[PDB]
Design a protein around this ligand. Sequence first.
Ligand SMILES: O=[N+]([O-])c1ccc(O)cc1
Length: 317
Amino acid sequence: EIVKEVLPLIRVYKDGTVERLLSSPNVAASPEDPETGVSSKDIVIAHNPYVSARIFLPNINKSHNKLPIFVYFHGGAFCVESAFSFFVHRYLNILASQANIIAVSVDFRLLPHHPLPAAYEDGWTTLQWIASHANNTATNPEPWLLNHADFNKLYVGGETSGANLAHNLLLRAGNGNQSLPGDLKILGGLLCCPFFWGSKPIGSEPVDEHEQSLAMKVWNLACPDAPGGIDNPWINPCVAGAPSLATLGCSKLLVTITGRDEFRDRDILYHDTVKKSGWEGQLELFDAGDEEHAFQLFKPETDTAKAMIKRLASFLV
Ligand SMILES: O=[N+]([O-])c1ccc(O)cc1
């Protein structure tokens, strides 16, 4: 008995069993990935609500300086994909080695059982957990963080909905009422093809088909009780009455887009809005080329993919 369905992403049955789109199976963490030299392990950030993660530590050939931390949130429209998939594992191995940074891939809660803002909270739980290492308030600290992490170089980011998640975290961080343990600051944000939408079609978005877009079905699954619906500031950050993008709680921000991504114009609008908002930080835009969103995870061997990774490495510093 089917209660909910957003094809091709997800089907939900009466008894809470779910069929999910699966683009790659999960793989085991590695003591040393053969191609990149990156070590990875799987850890528990919080038991309840349960939030786990894979942390990636690149080859330590020198240890004069500690390494930037990159908290990554996978794509998958809040309802599919995983922190531990073949694609994410292989991508972060490359990123961690090419950029020489520690990566933390967060397995945040998903629809159907955990509607937004669950995922957002899990992201915030992750950042608190990280900051608790910096001021020695962590209870079961991850030794890799204590030994190798530069806590003043915390970067937060992701793909599509994961990037929407990071964006939301940046706002929380730059809100005066909210702070991290030790008042740790996020240095930078990296949003790759972030999932943003709106009730009115814009740019090259098809007008007649708009109200039937997959983006709208995804959002209705993720947050049906959202006031304003598809114009809720969580999904439409450029909407009237949304918090000002001048309160983004970081100092540097890179937005990446692709030519074929559905959210290209939304992303472009987001960037321009950040620019003409008075946000004082360093703002950057990167057009990765004639590709789909997340293309670099699927085909990291292409010239286009390699150029994107090099770009990211120059940002994650
Ligand atoms: O990957 N994602 O997070 C997505 C993918 C497709 C979509 O329509 C919305 C979000």
